[PDB]
């Protein structure tokens, strides 16, 4: 079949600056080859059909020019609501290998901003479910990026941690983490403090901040 | 049978070309034939009747 | 006026059948119709693609007759077969006709010949497995007045079989600094979400905030306070 690999798998556009997004096919198997933009919780909208002439419904600024195997999709003026993930697929009648395209995530540039970093204890109820979790916040940092180490009395836990982002305000162009720890009722009982460690580009340093069982 | 390859003027069919193939078809259909020209080349065609 | 939709999406176990996808106010004959499958990360390829003769049936290389497409031009409707699933099967699927530009070039003459309205909007499958009961907990920061100028209170909803939760926070009073955050599938196989808003350190003490979750599949009202 054909292998397809976008050059960049994210790619950081500032708003009102001309950025370039190319495609490379293991070859150009047909003429035909389709630019795709992709919102989630919507229908995929296809940008340009055969890259010689734009599709009806898409802003002037996209242009698909291609050089060679590779395929370079140029935006000029990129916004917020314009910006969205880009799939590239060859057009042919003989389909069936079905390429697909590796994702590009346009995110807007902004000034960096250092994290905000919040505690919370496992509840009482969760504790008595026999479940315990330890959640480490994260908040207003610009990068997508963070780095996040859950250690109990300074002991490194792996795979018990578990981030989620929240996607990003688009006036806000900031994200925030949400780090969980996974424990049984037995291992919570044995380990007396639980402590995570933030590493950020915003932050001067790496800072850990630690609690133990029995604050309020 | 083709009248021009004999008496073009007179229209009388003689047989010009043999088919080597004994069978014969038991069906026949027109091929309709649309003309790929722009609406300046567009032109009336001649009838033709089975 | 077309009306695109896909019907028979429902969870379902490991090494299952599950029967689709269907078309109002057009005629299903005339065109093709083609199922897509997109997963979350990936581009979307087109698992099954179906003629509008429905003679040639048109699998991917990905899938090794997994997807078996029957479709009735009578019924307007088309039938998509999934046969051992598995949870990297899991996407939501697209149902949606695909057109070419096919135009003979006498003096530079291209027509489009193109229709992709009506899109379908798509169906989500998904395999559950060490299924519980929805739990919420409320969370709060150990000092309140030491925790910043700004301080973030958050509630935790954890062990959902079904699609996640609605959360809102004194039953949507409140707006200010409100973070979604998409549900990870755990090792268990039960996702984990959380909702936090931004609280001003002033409001904490003289004003108690109630977190008021309902969970819309298991119809469970949780009102949760600190």
Redesign the interface.
């Given at each position: 079949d054909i292998q397809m690999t976008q050059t960049p798998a994210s790619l950081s556009a500032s708003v009102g600056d001309r950025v370039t997004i190319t495609c490379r096919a293991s070859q150009n198997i047909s003429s035909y080859l389709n630019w795709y933009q992709q919102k989630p919780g919507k229908a995929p909208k296809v940008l340009i059909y055969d890259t010689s002439r734009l599709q009806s419904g898409v802003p002037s600024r996209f242009s698909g020019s291609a050089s060679g195997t590779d395929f370079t999709l140029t935006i000029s003026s990129l916004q917020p609501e314009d910006f969205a993930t880009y799939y590239c697929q060859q057009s042919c009648t003989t389909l069936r290998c079905w390429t697909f395209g590796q994702g590009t995530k346009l995110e807007i540039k902004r000034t960096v901003a250092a994290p905000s970093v919040f505690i919370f204890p496992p509840s009482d109820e969760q504790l008595k479910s026999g479940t315990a979790s330890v959640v480490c916040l994260l908040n207003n940092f610009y990068p997508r990026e963070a780095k996040v180490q859950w250690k109990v009395d300074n002991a490194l836990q792996s795979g018990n941690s578990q981030e989620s982002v929240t996607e990003q305000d688009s006036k806000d162009s900031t994200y925030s983490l949400s780090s969980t720890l996974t424990l049984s009722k037995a291992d919570y009982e044995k380990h007396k403090v639980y402590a995570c460690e933030v590493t950020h580009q915003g932050l001067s340093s790496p800072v850990t901040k630690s609690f133990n069982r029995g604050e309020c | 049978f083709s009248s021009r390859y004999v008496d073009l003027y007179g229209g009388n069919m003689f047989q010009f070309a043999t088919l080597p193939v004994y069978d014969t078809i038991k069906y026949y259909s027109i091929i309709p034939h649309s003309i790929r020209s722009i609406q300046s080349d567009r032109k009336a065609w001649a009838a033709f009747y089975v | 006026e077309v009306q695109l939709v896909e019907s028979g999406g429902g969870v379902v176990q490991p090494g299952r059948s599950l029967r689709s996808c269907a078309a109002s106010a057009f005629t299903f004959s005339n065109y093709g119709m083609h199922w897509?499958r997109?997963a979350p990360?990936?581009?979307?390829?087109?698992?099954a693609?179906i003629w509008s003769a429905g003679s040639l049936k048109?699998?991917?290389?990905?899938v090794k007759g997994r997807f078996i497409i029957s479709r009735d031009n009578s019924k307007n409707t088309l039938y998509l077969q999934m046969d051992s699933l598995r949870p990297e099967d899991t996407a939501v699927y697209?149902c949606?006709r695909e057109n070419?530009?096919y135009y003979?070039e006498?003096?530079g003459?291209?027509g489009?010949s193109?229709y992709?309205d009506f899109?379908?909007?798509?169906t989500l499958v998904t395999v559950s497995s060490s299924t519980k009961g929805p739990?919420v907990?409320?969370?709060?920061?150990?000092?309140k007045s030491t925790?910043?100028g700004?301080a973030?209170l958050?509630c935790?909803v954890?062990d959902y079989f079904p699609e996640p939760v609605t959360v809102s926070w004194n039953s949507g009073a409140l707006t200010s600094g409100v973070?979604?955050?998409?549900a990870?599938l755990?090792?268990s196989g039960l996702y984990?979400?959380?909702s936090?808003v931004t609280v001003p350190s002033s409001s904490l003490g003289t004003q108690t905030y109630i977190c008021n979750v309902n969970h819309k599949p298991s119809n469970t009202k949780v009102d949760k306070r600190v």
């Open positions: - | - | 897509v997109q990360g990936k581009g979307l390829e087109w698992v693609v048109y699998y991917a290389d990905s697209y949606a070419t530009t003979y006498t003096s003459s291209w489009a193109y992709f899109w379908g909007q798509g739990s907990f409320p969370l709060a920061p150990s000092s925790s910043g700004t973030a958050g935790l954890k973070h979604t955050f998409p990870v755990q090792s984990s979400l959380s936090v």
